[PDB]
């Protein structure tokens, strides 16, 4: 026979392999496909869809419908944050369970821009202005309107157009970020504050809630496939 | 408990290779890995063992790292894993330039965290020259064979 030589790796089984192999059922009449609406080409396009963020994860609210609700009030103006959030899409509890994040859990590196959309679900007679803020990492995490106002931010007016989107632009030292909670690859801080305050007339519910959604932008990508840790089998 | 090895992927446990790499500050390369496997009896007995198979799974940072030789991790749905039968050609795979940077850094003149004034020193500390630039996860390996009478 043709003189051949075995080189390293022969006989091994790498699960990530891609070769041809003999068929178990030759000449099997495969059933042709039909146009089933809604086919997906890549995982990222699921990522670009906006999913609701379980913000308030307090002992009482966690694992309950309420964790998706962020209560607002008509209290006089304060410079205190409404909600604080870390830019660790794949590792911070609040982001970790959104489709975006869940997806991110299947990869090791993440890169690109993200968008935060907020939905006011109070009454029509309710008015207000807010400041949603994204501060790149490295400094003191914002906790007062003041410092947050210095970073990237959208000032949102409550009105007929029910929702507002703030885009967190890709600002990173590295070409790709870690799916883990890490300092070198830290993402920054996301924060919401009252610009004015919530104002309602009489005979109007004084306290309301807000919904938040997060998704990827057309230039978001992930790499290095790994197994997730949000799933497991005991014995 | 049966022994399973876990090892973080680095070039810095040995010396020879390290120094060569260290002639430079930065480098780009695709890594080829080979796996030579040795095995031996330890207890002075006359019992027998049947050829072993070893699974070398690559656990990237973030993925669940095994706790038992027989836990759910070794199922490997997305972690690259090698199935090496003893007595055959050593195992060899290839991996591309996987750096988070544009090149692998051999020397880092910095840290990971910035200790801030209004933060506790403890909250702001990090190791000098330590960064994610070098965290590639771990390699986990076990003998696929079930418990044998003689070790």
């Amino acid at each position, epitope marked *: 026979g043709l003189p051949v030589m075995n080189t390293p790796g022969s006989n091994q089984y790498l699960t990530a392999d891609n070769f041809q192999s003999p068929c178990a059922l030759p000449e099997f009449d495969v059933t042709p496909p039909i146009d089933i609406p809604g086919e997906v080409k890549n995982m990222m396009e699921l990522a670009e869809i906006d999913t609701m963020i379980p913000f308030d994860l307090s002992a009482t609210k966690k694992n309950t419908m309420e964790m998706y609700r962020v209560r607002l009030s008509d209290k006089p103006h304060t410079d205190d944050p409404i909600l604080c959030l870390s830019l660790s899409p794949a590792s911070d509890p609040r982001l970790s369970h959104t489709m975006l994040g869940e997806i991110l859990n299947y990869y090791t590196h993440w890169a690109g821009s993200l968008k935060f959309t907020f939905l006011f679900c109070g009454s029509m007679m309710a008015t207000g202005k807010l400041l949603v803020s994204y501060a790149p990492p490295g400094a003191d995490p914002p906790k007062k309107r003041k410092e947050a106002m210095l970073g990237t931010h959208v000032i949102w007016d409550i009105g007929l157009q029910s929702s507002c989107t703030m885009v967190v632009p890709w600002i990173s030292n590295t070409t790709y970020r870690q799916t883990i*909670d890490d300092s070198f690859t830290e993402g920054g801080y996301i924060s919401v504050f009252y610009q004015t305050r919530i104002v309602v007339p009489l005979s109007t519910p004084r306290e309301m809630d807000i919904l938040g959604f997060v998704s990827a932008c057309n230039d978001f990508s992930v790499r290095l496939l790994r197994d997730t840790t949000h799933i497991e089998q005991k014995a | 408990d049966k022994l399973f090895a*876990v090892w973080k992927i680095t070039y810095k446990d040995t010396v020879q290779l390290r120094r060569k790499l260290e002639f430079f500050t930065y480098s780009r390369f695709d890594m080829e890995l080979t796996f030579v496997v040795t095995a031996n009896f330890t207890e002075t007995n006359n019992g027998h063992a049947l050829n072993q198979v070893y699974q070398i799974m690559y656990v990237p940072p*973030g993925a669940p790292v095994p706790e038992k030789w027989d836990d759910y991790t070794w199922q490997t749905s997305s972690n690259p894993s090698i199935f090496y039968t003893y007595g055959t050609a050593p195992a060899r795979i290839s991996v591309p330039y996987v750096g988070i940077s544009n090149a692998y850094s051999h020397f880092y003149d910095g840290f990971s965290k910035v200790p801030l004034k209004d933060q506790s020193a403890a909250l702001g500390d990090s190791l000098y020259g*330590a960064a994610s630039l070098n965290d590639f996860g771990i390699l986990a390996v076990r003998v696929v064979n079930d418990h044998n009478p003689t070790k």
Partner: nanobody
Amino acid sequence: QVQLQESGGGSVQTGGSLRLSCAASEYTQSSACMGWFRQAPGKEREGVAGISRFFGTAYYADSVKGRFTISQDKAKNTVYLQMNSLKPEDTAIYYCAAGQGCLTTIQALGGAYGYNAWGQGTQVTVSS
């Protein structure tokens, strides 16, 4: 993160045994040497105990060797801390400490520097 949830605040007298435990069920780059830090409101926060994730690299602070030991369950996932023969000098708030990439507790061996996930805090008083 990992899960870090600790308890065990029993104000025992001087010379009694106390057990401290911190959850570490989820398996991230898991708590290597782990970590136990006590903050004495007279002093500050300081490192104490720590056994490597897999290996037997357990570092002990000068003040607690022998009396205080570290051990865990490589399955049930929780980190135990046997603190016996308690002095009144050990009255402080303890904390568990996840040091991820094992090398974080191999290079420096002890925790403190390579520690990203912080525990809750349990008050332990050892008085007369």
